[PDB]
Amino acid sequence: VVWTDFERATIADIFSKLDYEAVGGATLARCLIVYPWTQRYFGNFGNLNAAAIMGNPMIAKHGTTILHGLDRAVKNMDNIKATYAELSVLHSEKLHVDPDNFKLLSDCLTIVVAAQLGKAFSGEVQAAFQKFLSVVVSALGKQYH
Amino acid sequence: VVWTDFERATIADIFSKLDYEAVGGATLARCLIVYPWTQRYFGNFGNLNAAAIMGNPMIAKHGTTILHGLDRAVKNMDNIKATYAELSVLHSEKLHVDPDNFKLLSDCLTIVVAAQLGKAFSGEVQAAFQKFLSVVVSALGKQYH
Amino acid sequence: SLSSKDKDAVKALWGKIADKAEEIGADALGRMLAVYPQTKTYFSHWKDLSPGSAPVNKHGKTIMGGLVDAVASIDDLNAGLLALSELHAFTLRVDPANFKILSHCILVQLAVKFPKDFTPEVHLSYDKFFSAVARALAEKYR
Amino acid sequence: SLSSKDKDAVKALWGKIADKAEEIGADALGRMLAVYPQTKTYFSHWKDLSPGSAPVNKHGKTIMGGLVDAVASIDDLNAGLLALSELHAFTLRVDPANFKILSHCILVQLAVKFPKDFTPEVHLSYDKFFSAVARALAEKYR
Numbered sequence: 167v168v169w170t171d172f173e174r175a176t177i178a179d180i181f182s183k184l185d186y187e188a189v190g191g192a193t194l195a196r197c198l199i200v201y202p203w204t205q206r207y208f209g210n211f212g213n214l215n216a217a218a219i220m221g222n223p224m225i226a227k228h229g230t231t232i233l234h235g236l237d238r239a240v241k242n243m244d245n246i247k248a249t250y251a252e253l254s255v256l257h258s259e260k261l262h263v264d265p266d267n268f269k270l271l272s273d274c275l276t277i278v279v280a281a282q283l284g285k286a287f288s289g290e291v292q293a294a295f296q297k298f299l300s301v302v303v304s305a306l307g308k309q310y311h
Numbered sequence: 312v313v314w315t316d317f318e319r320a321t322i323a324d325i326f327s328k329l330d331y332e333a334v335g336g337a338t339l340a341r342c343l344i345v346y347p348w349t350q351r352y353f354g355n356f357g358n359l360n361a362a363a364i365m366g367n368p369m370i371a372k373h374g375t376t377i378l379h380g381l382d383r384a385v386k387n388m389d390n391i392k393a394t395y396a397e398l399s400v401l402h403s404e405k406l407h408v409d410p411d412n413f414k415l416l417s418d419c420l421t422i423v424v425a426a427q428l429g430k431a432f433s434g435e436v437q438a439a440f441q442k443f444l445s446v447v448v449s450a451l452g453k454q455y456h
Numbered sequence: 457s458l459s460s461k462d463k464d465a466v467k468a469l470w471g472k473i474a475d476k477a478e479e480i481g482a483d484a485l486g487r488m489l490a491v492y493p494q495t496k497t498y499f500s501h502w503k504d505l506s507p508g509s510a511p512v513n514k515h516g517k518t519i520m521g522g523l524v525d526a527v528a529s530i531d532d533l534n535a536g537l538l539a540l541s542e543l544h545a546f547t548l549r550v551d552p553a554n555f556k557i558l559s560h561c562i563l564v565q566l567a568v569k570f571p572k573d574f575t576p577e578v579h580l581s582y583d584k585f586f587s588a589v590a591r592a593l594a595e596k597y598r
Numbered sequence: 599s600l601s602s603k604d605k606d607a608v609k610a611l612w613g614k615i616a617d618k619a620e621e622i623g624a625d626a627l628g629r630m631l632a633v634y635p636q637t638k639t640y641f642s643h644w645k646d647l648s649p650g651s652a653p654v655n656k657h658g659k660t661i662m663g664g665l666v667d668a669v670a671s672i673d674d675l676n677a678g679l680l681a682l683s684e685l686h687a688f689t690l691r692v693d694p695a696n697f698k699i700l701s702h703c704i705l706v707q708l709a710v711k712f713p714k715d716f717t718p719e720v721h722l723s724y725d726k727f728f729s730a731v732a733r734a735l736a737e738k739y740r
């Protein structure tokens with residue numbers, strides 16, 4: 167991946183405006199409600215009903231964890247694959263997460279961020295955010311190289 | 312990727328049994344017939360009806376090219392990503408082939424191979440074949456790393 | 457299948473956005489072209505792919521009209537979108553992998569302007585609608 | 599939507615495979631588990647995932663009877679498969695991304711046994727059929 171200056175500035179800019187607990191919690195809840203089969207991968211997280219998912223403290227926590235995971239890539243934009251080496255193993259060999267779900271979660275995060283940032287989330291800005299998520303999702307999936 | 316002795320010998324053994332012209336031509340035609348939207352990527356291969364696709368010589372030629380392309384990975388098992396570096400640029404930056412399409416073609420290939428090899432195409436054989444195709448399609452898709 | 461709940465939720469969103477509909481179409485199409493540049497191959501006629509270019513403007517109106525039609529036809533999208541499905545299959549030959557991309561860009565565009573309408577349960581209704589729209593447009597491929 | 603041509607093709611295949619159907623389900627399941635080990639999580643109660651073990655043999659029979667129901671309901675898969683959809687959604691909670699995997703393994707399995715039936719046009723019908731089955735099983739997810 168070759169990042170442009172605009173892209174690096176925009177990605178750091180976006181994440182500096184996101185409360186990881188709020189956005190992460192919201193993003194994960196959104197995924198589990200819009201794509202409810204995604205709940206099966208969290209079968210050990212308790213009471214999951216939309217209000218139940220909205221109120222679940224484990225989901226709030228795990229949502230925060232995801233945003234912190236993404237922060238690792240923001241702080242290492244030229245070395246995302248290596249940074250995510252153990253996460254990629256975890257989500258494949260251990261958790262057997264079908265890779266489409268990474269796209270589902272990414273699209274939820276994008277909608278959450280678009281709602282927060284409003285007019286500021288222009289086509290150009292979304293283009294940079296999506297390049298970033300594509301690199302992240304490629305690094306999170308099973309690695310064949 | 313790390314290949315087991317079994318996987319390595321199985322892949323070379325499968326390809327040693329294929330008529331690249333017969334299998335490649337049947338495979339590309341199968342894909343263009345079963346998933347007709349993939350025809351768009353080939354809008355300069357002349358006439359593409361099932362009988363027309365089946366008798367289309369450029370389709371026959373190009374299916375052959377694909378099989379020799381796969382043979383290249385067979386001969387470079389431990390260096391498939393680099394081996395496919397230019398093909399990946401071609402299929403993404405130049406042709407803009409949605410990566411879902413690689414899976415569609417791989418699946419057609421597998422069913423063509425299954426029909427030919429019959430009972431010899433066991434689950435354990437298919438597993439090795441599918442690993443190889445997974446590594447290949449990963450090396451052919453856009454490279455983020 | 458969309459519930460009565462989903463249908464009401466979708467039709468109400470569509471009423472709410474009416475004033476801003478042509479803007480929405482233009483910007484969503486702008487987003488798709490810039491964010492997912494693989495889609496550019498279908499529109500290589502247009503020299504100016506910026507939203508607010510006349511052609512992006514005009515075609516954005518058309519997509520939103522197609523979606524207003526889908527809304528009118530929400531009880532049987534397959535029947536209601538048969539002509540448009542045929543067109544995207546045979547006159548154009550759009551790769552139906554692309555339908556999901558446009559849908560996402562419309563949802564994103566809408567979220568930037570109407571963020572309060574994007575509760576998880578409403579987003580669930582909108583996503584089912586766009587998924588059924590995509591499936592209806594895919595009907596005539598094979 | 600399956601055409602009447604597609605429905606005829608599927609019925610004709612289904613007739614041809616009867617003597618071997620139970621073995622076709624067992625092998626297809628065996629292929630799924632070994633070729634796509636992400637599916638093993640749904641069956642981690644089977645000590646032996648080989649196509650000759652008793653759990654796999656007995657469950658391949660069950661899959662094939664589900665598919666025989668689908669052949670009998672081919673005019674409306676969505677209505678005919680409703681309980682199986684709700685089961686896969688809510689009791690077993692199966693990522694509906696796995697349906698296409700099993701479809702594929704059934705087709706591979708069939709190809710190894712009945713290669714003469716895999717003309718391009720027949721394969722097209724069989725794939726439309728399996729896709730419609732998977733879409734029907736996906737119905738009650740949301």
Ligand code: HEM
Nearest residue numbers: 204207208231232235236257261263267268271272302306
């Ligand atoms: C942008 C995509 C994602 C990122 C950045 C991400 C990041 C993370 C991180 C940082 C962890 C904690 C690992 C640790 O303990 O060190 C984790 C765990 C986990 N993730 Fe993901 N994840 C993503 C997508 C997904 C998706 C789509 C699913 C399910 C469909 C999933 C399911 C899980 C599960 C089940 C755990 C174990 C949680 C626990 O028990 O602590 N992840 N992920």
Ligand code: HEM
Nearest residue numbers: 349352353376377380381398402406408412413416417451
């Ligand atoms: C197993 C996956 C594939 C392999 C190994 C493969 C390999 C190749 C090779 C070796 C070439 C010739 C490159 C050159 O001229 O320098 C090629 C070209 C091409 N491929 Fe692929 N290919 C694959 C899949 C696909 C798919 C799925 C599509 C579209 C659906 C596609 C579309 C094309 C097109 C349009 C060309 C250029 C044709 C021409 O100008 O003659 N390929 N591919």
Ligand code: HEM
Nearest residue numbers: 495498499515518519521522523548550554555558559589
């Ligand atoms: C929500 C899904 C979509 C809807 C409702 C939709 C609707 C429409 C409508 C109403 C037209 C005009 C037809 C006419 O003038 O008779 C059209 C044309 C067209 N569509 Fe779509 N469309 C959708 C998705 C797509 C996608 C995803 C692509 C490609 C990435 C695409 C490519 C085209 C092209 C190339 C035309 C012709 C435009 C021109 O000639 O300038 N469409 N669409």
Ligand code: HEM
Nearest residue numbers: 637640641660661663664665682690692696697700701731
């Ligand atoms: C062609 C698509 C499928 C059909 C027609 C089908 C059919 C069935 C039927 C009829 C049963 C009832 C079992 C019984 O009464 O003993 C069942 C159970 C089950 N299915 Fe499916 N199924 C399909 C796909 C899948 C997939 C892709 C998975 C997971 C990867 C899955 C996981 C399960 C599990 C875990 C059970 C319970 C098995 C047990 O009780 O031991 N199914 N299926």
